[PDB]
Amino acid sequence: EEYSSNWAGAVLIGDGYTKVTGEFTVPSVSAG
Amino acid sequence: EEYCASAWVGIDGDTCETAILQTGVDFCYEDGQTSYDAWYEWYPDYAYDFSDITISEGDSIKVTVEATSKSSGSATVENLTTGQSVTHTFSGNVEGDLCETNAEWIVEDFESGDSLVAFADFGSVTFTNAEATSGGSTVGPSDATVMDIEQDGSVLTETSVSGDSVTVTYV
Incomplete structure (x- = not known):
């Protein structure tokens, strides 16, 4: 994996991306 | 104290520095209350809220960004x-040209105030039907670079991907 201070997730590196989509359920949040 | 996190999909911003086309939802917590909102942004321009849509805990959201040209x-x-x-x-009149080299599904600790906003414990966020289109063909996150948040000597997330999904869990 790669660490960063602000992003967590998945990143595709390539060429010609013209559309990105995803579906998720709104989470329950509490204090960190 | 208020804690927040955001989940969004977007094009560019990692290896392409001139722009980011992104859209998503912010989730915030503060003293027994929660606040949710949807927004869009074509970095370097500001993020703007979608005021005509209600977001609640547990709702199923589908987010999509599409580029008809680099601008x-x-x-x-x-x-x-x-x-x-x-x-x-x-339609154009944007402040930055896309390179179209990155497609991503991200949970972010966004900037607010002097630094990043206090990061909320969101449990877990799973993006399903995670697909990117390149050259007319659709691809999933299988070969994607996995990223996690690390601040002040603390790992705050654990990410796992499958052939069609991305799961980010708070640590």
Whole structure:
């Protein structure tokens, strides 16, 4: 994996991306 | 104290520095209350909120960004649970050109104030039907670079991907 201070997730590196989509359920949040 | 996090999909911003076309939802917590909102942004311009859509805990959201050229496209947020759908079209007049080299599904600790906003414990966020289109063909996150947040000597997330999904869990 790669660490960063602000992003967590998945990143595709390539060429010609013209559309990105995803579906998720709104989470329950509490204090960190 | 208020804690927040955001989840969004977007094009560019990692290896392409001139722009980011992105859309998503912010979730915040503060003293027994929560606040949710949907927004769009074509970085370096500011993020703007979609005021005509209600987001609630547990709702199923589908987010999509599409580029019709390196300087035009759209951002769409659909609340599948309520049937609401909003789209912002960027006909041009943008402040940055896309390279179209990165496609991503991200949970972010965004900047607010002097630094990053206190990071909320969101449990876990799973993006399903995670697909990117390149050259007319669709690809999933299988070969994607996995990223996690690490601040002040603390790992705050654990990410796992499958052939069609991305799961980010708070640590």
